[PDB]
Amino acid sequence: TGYLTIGGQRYQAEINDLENLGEMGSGTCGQVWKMRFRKTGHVIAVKQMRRSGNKEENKRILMDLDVVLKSHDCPYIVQCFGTFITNTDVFIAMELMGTSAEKLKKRMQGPIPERILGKMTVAIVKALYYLKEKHGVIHRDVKPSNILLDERGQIKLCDFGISGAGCAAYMAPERIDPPDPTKPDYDIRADVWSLGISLVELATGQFPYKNCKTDFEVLTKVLQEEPPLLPGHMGFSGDFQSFVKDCLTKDHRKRPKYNKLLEHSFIKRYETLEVDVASWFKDVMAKTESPGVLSQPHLPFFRH
């Protein structure tokens, strides 16, 4: 028996009862099913953790679940409705999101509007602050694939890796080469940097360390080059440009913490400015739904 808390109610459920609407999210491994709970009509994501599965993958699934289970009071973290434990599997019922920001950027082929990014920033900073203040968790993997959006207009931090070497591309300078390698810190400030990179990427439609061909090359650009700010040509508000600049402070000792970010005019304004994220999202997802083009043949050998 599964025990689900959804729609304000508690339900004793059987896993074979859930209507299977097909496999989902082949791009972030772990088996996940889109399912309908027939008693209510909610459509949910159900993760299947096999008893036979890779031990490292299961370890991460369980650690993440532990944090999600105790994060019900954060509006900005995807929720777990409950679990079913069987002889061979654990099925984890999760809130279904429509896409990640990585997928949105890919399907749009261009920028996400500032007003959406403002709502996103408020949600993600609040989720990261919650994780650290309430649970002592330093996320360590902030990036567009971990920022989820839905047709309701909600924006939430993903469960994947929520419980806390890294994705080069979003790594802070002090994760690559800290000014003091003995300081235990890890530190939240590294995630503030990754948020900044993410925002520049999404606001421009281009990851800001251009044309790197290897992981190490990107690390070199983080350390050697100026921080990659929002362009000034492009119509972004002064407040957004400042927020990004602050997040992309190279010296972590001078980079703001979440409590200071939460006072920044970019966040403060978007806590209450009305933005219709739901309509934006629906319109984008429909318009980018379908396209039909044959790939180029490899060039034949030529003796130069």
Active site residue 141: yes
Catalytic residue among 89, 141, 239, 246: 141
Q: Are the C-beta atoms of residues 219 and 176 closer than 8 Å to each other?
A: yes
Residues making up the annotated binding site are 24-32, 47
Residues making up the annotated binding site for ATP are 24-32, 47
Enter the tokens of residue 213.
Answer: 């061909």
List Cα–Cα distances, 230 to 30, 110, 142, 270, in angstroms: 35, 14, 18, 18
Which distant-in-sequence residues (6+ apart) come within 8 Å of 272 by Cβ?
none
How far apart, in whole angstroms, are the C-alpha atoms of residue 228 and residue 196? 9
Strand partners, 46: 33, 93
Enter the tokens of residue 101.
Answer: 């920001």
Q: Are the C-beta atoms of residues 79 and 159 closer than 8 Å to each other?
A: no
* 54-84 exposure pattern, b = at least 16 Cβ within 10 A, e = fewer: eeeebebbeebbebbeebeebebbbbbbbbb
How far apart, in whole angstroms, are the C-alpha atoms of residue 237 and residue 118? 11
Catalogue the active-site residues: 141
